[PDB]
Design an enzyme around this catalytic site. Structure first.
Site, short mmCIF file in Angstrom:
data_model
loop_
_atom_site.label_atom_id
_atom_site.label_comp_id
_atom_site.label_asym_id
_atom_site.label_seq_id
_atom_site.Cartn_x
_atom_site.Cartn_y
_atom_site.Cartn_z
N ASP A 13 1.11 -1.22 0.02
CA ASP A 13 -0.10 -0.26 0.18
C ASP A 13 1.05 0.91 -0.14
O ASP A 13 0.31 2.41 0.41
CB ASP A 13 -0.41 0.08 0.98
CG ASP A 13 -2.09 -1.36 1.75
OD1 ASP A 13 -3.02 -1.12 0.45
OD2 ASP A 13 -1.33 -1.94 2.23
N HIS A 43 -4.35 -2.14 -6.06
CA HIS A 43 -3.40 -0.80 -5.92
C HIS A 43 -4.71 -0.04 -6.91
O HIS A 43 -5.35 -0.17 -8.41
CB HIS A 43 -2.84 -1.04 -7.40
CG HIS A 43 -1.08 -2.39 -7.16
ND1 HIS A 43 -0.53 -2.38 -7.83
CD2 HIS A 43 -1.32 -2.56 -5.51
CE1 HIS A 43 0.46 -3.21 -6.63
NE2 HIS A 43 0.13 -3.70 -5.15
#
EC number: 6.3.4.4
Length: 321
Positions: A13, A43
């Site tokens: 992340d 993503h």
């Protein structure tokens, strides 16, 4: 030409998606292969106000003039694959998406993401492959082939991994890690490319590291504090509230060394300093902001070629002169 591998140096992340998106449009690579584990990572990227989240298809779909491939070392989930093909139907991905016929498939019995259980049988040679399912055929191909072909033709190839060094199966916070190595070397093997064929390696980092679930977080900060600074994030697939902590230069240096990072990327700098939001010119950054950056380059030993000052595409400082 200078092949670029994008990987995370934290616990996922870090914003790998945003960076890949930028490079996909600015550099306009002919191929954008995806590596890593499978779909246990979503993503995200903000395209002109619209927030996107992909778990199977590369984060370079906005680049219509480029093929989207998936490494053989990556797990594929038929359900999510087709779902995203519809979600990105406006980009006509279904026409330029290719899945390696040697990719392992994630079955429902695994999902009982299913990436973990899938790899279990993967290394046990009990799971099927992409060419074993009928639904998946018009997309099958040899990613390792196309990548090398274009690589020899001096074509630009951009590959992106998943998770981060912190979740590495070998160099991660075991047992609190993923089901495989997420280093630049591994990602290269996932797409089928030699180490000598790799020119650039970009290790992404974000102002404030995050964690998802149990695991050692040395720089972790009380969630009460994360609320004041406004660093509360929710999983794009689980909606889970990730744990926050201050930057960990020690780890950043280590994770950048093993990955052989030739360039560093920092994201969400606006979260570290509000006065840096929107900045496009490094010299126009506020003192506090420049302090952090410079400090990172000196502690990691690698210069930052990219800096994200916002969620938007235009919100970034490209200093790869």
């Amino acid at each position: 030409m200078p092949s670029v591998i994008v990987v995370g140096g934290q616990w996922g992340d870090e914003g790998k998606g945003s960076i890949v998106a930028y490079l996909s449009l600015h550099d306009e690579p002919e191929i954008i292969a995806r590596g890593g584990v499978g779909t246990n990572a979503g993503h995200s990227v903000v395209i002109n106000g619209k927030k996107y989240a992909v778990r199977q298809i590369p984060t370079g779909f906005m680049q219509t003039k480029a093929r989207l491939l998936i490494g053989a070392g990556v797990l594929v989930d038929p359900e999510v694959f087709f779902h995203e093909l519809e979600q990105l139907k406006d980009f006509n991905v279904k026409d330029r998406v290719g899945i390696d016929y040697r990719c392992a498939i994630i079955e429902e019995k695994h999902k009982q993401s299913g990436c973990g259980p899938a790899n279990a049988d993967r290394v046990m040679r009990k799971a099927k492959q992409a060419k074993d399912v009928k639904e998946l055929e018009p997309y099958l191909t040899d990613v390792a082939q196309e990548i090398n072909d274009a690589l020899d033709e001096g074509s630009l190839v951009l590959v992106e991994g998943t998770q981060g060094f912190g979740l590495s199966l070998y160099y991660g916070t075991y047992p609190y890690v993923t089901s495989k190595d997420v280093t630049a070397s591994s990602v290269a093997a996932d797409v089928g490319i030699g180490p000598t064929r790799v020119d650039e390696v970009i290790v992404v980092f974000k102002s404030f590291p995050t964690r998802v679930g149990a695991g050692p977080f040395p720089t972790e900060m009380p969630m009460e504090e994360a609320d004041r600074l406004g660093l509360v994030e929710y999983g794009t697939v689980t909606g889970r509230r990730r744990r926050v902590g201050w930057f960990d230069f020690e780890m950043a240096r280590y994770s950048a060394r093993i990955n052989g990072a030739t360039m560093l990327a920092v994201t969400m700098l606006d979260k570290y300093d509000k006065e840096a939001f929107g900045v496009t010119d490094y010299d126009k950054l506020p003192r506090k902001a420049k302090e952090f950056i410079e400090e990172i380059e000196e502690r990691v030993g690698v210069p930052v070629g990219l800096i994200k000052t916002g969620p938007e595409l235009e919100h970034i400082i490209d200093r790869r002169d």
